[PDB]
Amino acid sequence: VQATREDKFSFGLWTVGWQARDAFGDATRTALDPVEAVHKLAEIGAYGITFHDDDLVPFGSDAQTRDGIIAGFKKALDETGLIVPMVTTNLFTHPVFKDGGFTSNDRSVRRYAIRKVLRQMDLGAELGAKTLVLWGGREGAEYDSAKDVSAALDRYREALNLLAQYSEDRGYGLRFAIEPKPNEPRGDILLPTAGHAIAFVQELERPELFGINPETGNEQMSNLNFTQGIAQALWHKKLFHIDLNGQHGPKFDQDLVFGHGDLLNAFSLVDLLENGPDGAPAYDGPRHFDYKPSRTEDYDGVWESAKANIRMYLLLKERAKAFRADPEVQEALAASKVAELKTPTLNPGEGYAELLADRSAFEDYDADAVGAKGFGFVKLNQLAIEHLLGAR
Amino acid sequence: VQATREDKFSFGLWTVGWQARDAFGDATRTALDPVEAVHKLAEIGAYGITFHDDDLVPFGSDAQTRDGIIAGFKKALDETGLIVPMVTTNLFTHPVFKDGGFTSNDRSVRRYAIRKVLRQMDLGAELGAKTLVLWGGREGAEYDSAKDVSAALDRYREALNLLAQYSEDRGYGLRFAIEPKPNEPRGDILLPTAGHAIAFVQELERPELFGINPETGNEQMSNLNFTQGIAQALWHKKLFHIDLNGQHGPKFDQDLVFGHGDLLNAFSLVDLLENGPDGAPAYDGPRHFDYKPSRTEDYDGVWESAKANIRMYLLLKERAKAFRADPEVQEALAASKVAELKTPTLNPGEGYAELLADRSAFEDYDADAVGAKGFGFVKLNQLAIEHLLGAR
Amino acid sequence: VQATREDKFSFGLWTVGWQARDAFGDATRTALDPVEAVHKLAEIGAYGITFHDDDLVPFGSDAQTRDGIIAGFKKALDETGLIVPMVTTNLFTHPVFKDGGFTSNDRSVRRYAIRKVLRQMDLGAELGAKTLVLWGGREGAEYDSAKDVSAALDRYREALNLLAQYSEDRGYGLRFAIEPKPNEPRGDILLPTAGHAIAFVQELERPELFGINPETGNEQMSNLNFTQGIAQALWHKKLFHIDLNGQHGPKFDQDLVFGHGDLLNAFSLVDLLENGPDGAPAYDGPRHFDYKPSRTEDYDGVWESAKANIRMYLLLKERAKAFRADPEVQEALAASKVAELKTPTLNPGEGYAELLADRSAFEDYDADAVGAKGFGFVKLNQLAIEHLLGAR
Amino acid sequence: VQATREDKFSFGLWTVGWQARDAFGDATRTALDPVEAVHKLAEIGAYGITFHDDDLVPFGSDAQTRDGIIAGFKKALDETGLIVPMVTTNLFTHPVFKDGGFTSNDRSVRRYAIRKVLRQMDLGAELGAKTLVLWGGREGAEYDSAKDVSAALDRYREALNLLAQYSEDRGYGLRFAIEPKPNEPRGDILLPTAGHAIAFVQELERPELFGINPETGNEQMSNLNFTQGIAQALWHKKLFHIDLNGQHGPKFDQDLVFGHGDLLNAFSLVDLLENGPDGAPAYDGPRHFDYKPSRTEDYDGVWESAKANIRMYLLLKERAKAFRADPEVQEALAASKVAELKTPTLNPGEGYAELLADRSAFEDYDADAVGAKGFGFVKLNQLAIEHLLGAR
């Protein structure tokens, strides 16, 4: 299986370009040139590329310099036919951001954080980006008495309301996707799970403009079911973007290739996104890989790992489709009553008065008998895994 | 320290009444008589008691029995002065609920679960309860393909909307509090965190009647910061009730005495609830203990553990108070700029255009100079712990 | 595929016999008759059955009854051809063991626990069992000041020394396998990991008679790499038995079918046990499934789940072999230098003197040139996974 | 309280010298001069300093440069009276060590790793160090097939045996302490817990020269009980050194000040170390702080944090002492039967024959009556916390 532009695989400049300088060691790879990255990604089948401001234009470049880089970049885009679906802002590397960007205790950093983002918004607008991803990696704390959470939420809100105002006035048409993470680099980060981020967004001035950008690994760092949180995000209609990668439970952020961590959950996730409502996908945005080529790899390893991401997705897609088309699976789904959940509990026009009048829903209900029948969930699970292993 | 009714300490009948039958062994204690529980709790300083329908009236009791039990319980409350601030329904023990109550794949189970709850709502209203707690312990799955999360959320919503309709029509004036839990007993439970529960509630028909009942150990089972989560719940004004207990990170649900698990977090929590805006608590409801006397204890051990919860809460309060009152802390708070987060980032009437025109927010900003000043956070943190330790 | 007796699939009576009473609900299945269990397991392909004393003969059975049960049990084995490779003792269910068996604070409990095991050793010897599995599920504490760990290790040693003495004197020829578990049911269990259990065994009187019985889920409950721990156990030659099941990281003990938790680690484990040196398996004992059919299931789901354990192991075995036989994998192993780790670091006869004299190992070593070369681990991992997906 | 040289508090040069460059951002602090670090530490009460070769002498310094640094270093030590109790080698920073030191798949890296270590042993021996700590941070894997564990353990052992040999031949009198860590920077690290390292040490040629250097957060990263694993290390007599710090369960390595993570476990750890058998401490080596001043701090916060480690230890020690001298705590200990575990289970001269003969141990044992007695553990835990809280 080969990738098509229709597959919408995108990669951040910072994924393949990660020099593998970790918390305990020096970089093992030299810098990757952006024009080069565009060319290489175009070649493996990516339809788009994304970047933080500081990944493209080095922090503090004079305008001449900055202007020069963008022009080169745009040309590479042009030539390869690659788009920029999303852009983001680095509000975490520079020391000024050590206590946060939008929620730093220091009022002056907060002000600067907003200016840095407005600037990136203009560039995204210029390149045709549709989504602004906001990853508040430095928002949070190491000690509970150091951060007033309430005030922090007020200030996070204050900042986002302004960005939407500006986008709307200017006619940029951007959608804003908040990216949740429980920890790292901060002991605890504000808006730690998909849920916390969706609940927060519901409180902004133009909520219709806000959604989330959940990352496989970030939910798994708390041992949460990623597929299940994406299902809820889809239910709320707030899945604006997705970051795919791999992780092995709660430990530092690994950023493995998609599917290299929890494989079973990678399978159920592809099934969810692709075997949507009609026959059609339940999700129509970019399939963005936010991973890191392992520190043990050279540039051959980097390109191999980029390809591996696409390969894992396409292989899982193929088995998800086969799973749903199998008659034996249909039968197992029927025995487990999966579809019965979609039928309303109440009959049309039934309220509490009618339910209370139904002796069979309670007074004459044989709970003991119903409780003895099996759901056949193990058998259904076993057919799924056999599809995954190509055993059927 | 002594507990007063103004402290609002409540205990579930199922807490002190837990017979200590765990997943690997038989009960080590005999059954506690509801009436006796009422007298003992009154005695240790509790202001109220809570119960699941099946904790007071054995599942399947005739109305004659059922009625008799309610009558006696009512007398005991009478004589002791205890109130019933909250009631809940057992939608997890009986085999019929093996796949959930409200979200069972079986339609008949769903109808049945609603009836069970309406009935408990009646008793609650009769005893003066103000909050109905809903713990969906069996709503979820062990396998991804077994549960359509979207359909599940629709059915959860359908059931809750009917419940609010009924209470409002009967004039019960109840508040509904959804209690989030990540897992146990299902592999994964729907609405796994305080964040997911809040996001869901915002989608109901009468959202103002719904909030959450977060539990200390539930959030800690995912290694989340309970205090930070409550802070967010408070920002949303959805903290309708709270279950206090202890846990040692991600492992089975321990249900230790409040403060016997993450002690540092227990401290920041009491500080949050009690040192609210303008002296006054930030939270006004019951301080409810949903814990279990360890399996190694006898009734002596049981009463001891009941008192330990009150004791822990009162000792923490006392230190939280002293912490805030200390001029040295006051000074460290100032140096760390904790209160500066309360000042809007933007000046009065300032928008994007005035901010874009302010050179000091970007063009002329010295990020390197600001990036080098320390926040003094370790020192503030050490002052808090010395207060906790009674060394200051 | 199909299981043969040479596969050595064994199951505990308590596995398929689990009635599904969990920490939060009643049993959903009726009791399983042991003779029937023997028959059903024989039919699905098991070569042996195991059990706790109390699984077979009800706690507090008179001599007559006990004798009666054993004789019927022996006939079923007879008739079917199943053997009893291992036996174990229940030291966790009865209330008397709430603080442990062998390390109970109470001396009379320790004496009783020893007696209870001697008696099972006799029945085990009589049924032809080769291994005595010892799971100290109640050995540990909820509170640090409640248990003197050093004294508990002394008492643990003291009880095992005696069991070895007895078995050697009676000529039973048993091997003893300690099973480590980090928590559940105690807050913290003694000998929490495979490592702690091997270190302990080394301090016994006749260490050659002791090894471990690691369980997949137990190590995963602590987020450790099961395959890697089993590779260490085999290095030490302490892999006396193994319990196979599934788990989804740090949370309550799930006991899923083998391969239904961490699929990637189940694959690497099967590869390690089967693609041993000299073509042959690195492990020759029983492949024992210590799992539980989900509570949502009836007796059909029970046999279905029993068969799934076998099918999972065999499908994985098949892919592990294809993996190792693939020329492209062979090429990736070479580029990764996996086998170069097997060649000694020092040339034959070289010691520190000769190493010190080698300028090429330090003074003239180009660490920078070496550090630039990649290991091709990502490609190697991608090939393993494609073999697992049946995509190659 | 004030620290005395008798307290034996030591710090790594790399703790107070951490420039705070994390996985997501640049350093926030300038480098600390080693001579200045020696003077500052002496001033806060440390008795010793430790260092990795590369902390003191920049990787690749010519011999003139290295010699000068060493001489200024020794003068500072001289002048302040601080000693060097342990030394260590950096086998994790340079790109060459990306696949490990002693266990890299690449043979030449393994030879270079041993020479780097031998060179540090000479410098340690000349500074008077008695312990060589070995932290194999890069020994491990991100993928299961990339590393042969058995070969890795063989290579590990091969390097360690040579080091013992050289030391013994040179009369250096060093003791070796392996430091276990579960993950970070490798996905999975070899010898993941104190248990795994102890079991490995037992297989070396001269086991008596080898022990472990366990770190508080390292075991907490796996959610294990640190005090309980230290208790077991003490039972084996392998606690050669200890690294003290704070962590909040399973997440990246936080390296907080000691006591700022799991306060209750810090308390029980100090109790174990100081309130050893015979009035005296159970452990007499250095109390080493391997922590990092938070990225939010400047040099004032760095010294505040160094002082916080010592304060934390002394406050907990004071409370542990008061705890044990409390006649009420003693009475609770007697009621909980803690000391009764210290009494052999078997009577002097009793063997299995006599045990089998004691009907009080079984035939006439009333399991049921014993099973109903409470142990009073909750009450005991409550008194312990009241002491920590300074409430008693």
Ligand SMILES: OC[C@@H](O)[C@H](O)[C@@H](O)CO
């Ligand atoms: O944890 C790292 C984060 O995922 C970032 O890569 C964001 O997605 C973009 O700032």
Ligand SMILES: OC[C@@H](O)[C@H](O)[C@@H](O)CO
């Ligand atoms: O995890 C168990 C839950 O906390 C329950 O006790 C609820 O609060 C009431 O059903």
Ligand SMILES: OC[C@@H](O)[C@H](O)[C@@H](O)CO
């Ligand atoms: O966690 C429970 C244990 O796995 C038991 O099944 C043992 O293996 C036998 O006592």
Ligand SMILES: OC[C@@H](O)[C@H](O)[C@@H](O)CO
């Ligand atoms: O996790 C980092 C390690 O703990 C090191 O500080 C070692 O103690 C010495 O190399």
Ligand SMILES: [Mg+2]
């Ligand atoms: Mg991301």
Ligand SMILES: [Mg+2]
């Ligand atoms: Mg609760």
Ligand SMILES: [Mg+2]
């Ligand atoms: Mg087992």
Ligand SMILES: [Mg+2]
């Ligand atoms: Mg260390």
